[PDB]
């Protein structure tokens with residue numbers, strides 16, 4: 001609006017993508033990015049992959065080159081923590097006491113690592129006990145990915161698995177602990193969890209499921225972890241401990257500002273929070289999925305880009321793209337893993353291919369409806385799966401597992417059934 005000033009809280013992929021999106025959709029007003037992080041906004045996925053492997057330059061991580069902020073006239077204010085929002089005056093209050101005025105406010109606060117209770121005090125503070133979320137976290141762990149050293153990963157989520165895969169490649173003695181009965185218990189089917197556990201075990205990782213960490217042993221001098229103790233009494237000697245038991249959405253700001261909060265900042269079809277002038281986006285945002293007809297909060301890059309762009313369109317009086325099936329990816333041992341949709345509430349699963357090799361797709365179904373698909377080294381079936389989920393195609397369930405029948409044809413028939421037959 002040439003006059004309307006927009007303020008974005010959070011310099012993560014979400015906030016940065018909103019900033020450049022805005023200026024790309026023809027926003028002439030001023031754009032301010034305020035983030036507590038001091039570093040240059042960078043990519044996160046590399047931190048448990050190539051960067052964690054020391055095979056990518058720090059420079060390749062930048063979301064956008066520093067010149068780009070200048071060129072696009074985007075003001076970046078780092079190392080600054082926003083402590084409050086005054087919806088009334090329409091201001092943002094910094095930790096130094098300063099205040100910024102806004103006509104439009106975007107909350108791209110992401111989330112923070114969920115603290116491991118038995119790791120409070122000295123444990124957490126140790127140089128060899130880290131969580132993985134910041135550039136600093138990554139480099140600190142990378143400096144310690146040492147051959148023959150012993151690593152204990154506490155947490156069996158995708159990042160946990162990606163870390164274990166990188167540490168293994170680095171020839172460390174790796175042990176991964178999960179309280180769940182099987183890795184990725186909540187988001188995949190048993191046979192899928194079996195694939196990962198065998199993949200990693202085969203690779204050398206010792207996975208201990210249904211295992212709980214009661215505490216740690218430490219050295220009095222260095223104040224470093226020396227071992228991980230399990231509830232069952234097992235002692236795991238450790239040189240490095242990487243904890244990851246989930247993410248906590250940063251909602252405090254909206255919470256104290258009277259905005260609706262529920263395991264994330266609540267937004268409507270227009271990305272608006274309880275307050276019309278305030279929008280939320282990214283890992284922090286809880287929105288309604290019309291595709292699944294329920295409130296969700298996605299923590300993924302594609303989710304950030306989709307939401308970010310939508311916000312830019314709206315604020316620029318443009319029309320937002322139609323909701324797209326959610327998806328994300330994971331890279332482990334060079335295996336291309338891509339997942340689309342949300343598997344919650346599935347009745348059965350159908351495996352298209354053999355689970356005895358990284359080359360198959362797993363369709364998650366609730367009745368005859370396909371909820372999600374996890375593909376392993378199948379980029380084309382993944383793209384085709386996107387279509388099915390998004391457009392709710394009536395693909396024939398009994399043909400999904402049959403590999404003699406191309407997925408393209410199964411889809412073609414489903415679309416044909418939609419046209420000529422009621």
Ligand SMILES: Cc1cc2nc3c(=O)[nH]c(=O)nc-3n(C[C@H](O)[C@H](O)[C@H](O)COP(=O)(O)OP(=O)(O)OC[C@H]3O[C@@H](n4cnc5c(N)ncnc54)[C@H](O)[C@@H]3O)c2cc1C
Pocket residue numbers: 009010011012013014015034035036037043044045046047048080081082083108109110111132133134159250253281282283284298299300301302304327328329330331
């Ligand atoms: C190691 C790792 C690997 C990943 N790999 C993948 C992957 O392979 N594929 C995929 O799809 N996704 C992956 N993700 C997730 C993906 O990176 C994120 O979902 C995406 O980048 C969106 O992040 P965000 O910007 O919403 O939140 P964040 O990246 O957390 O950004 C929010 C920023 O706002 C700051 N902030 C919060 N409150 C305030 C405040 N009051 N004042 C100032 N600043 C504040 C936060 O400190 C933070 O810097 C990975 C994440 C990690 C950590």
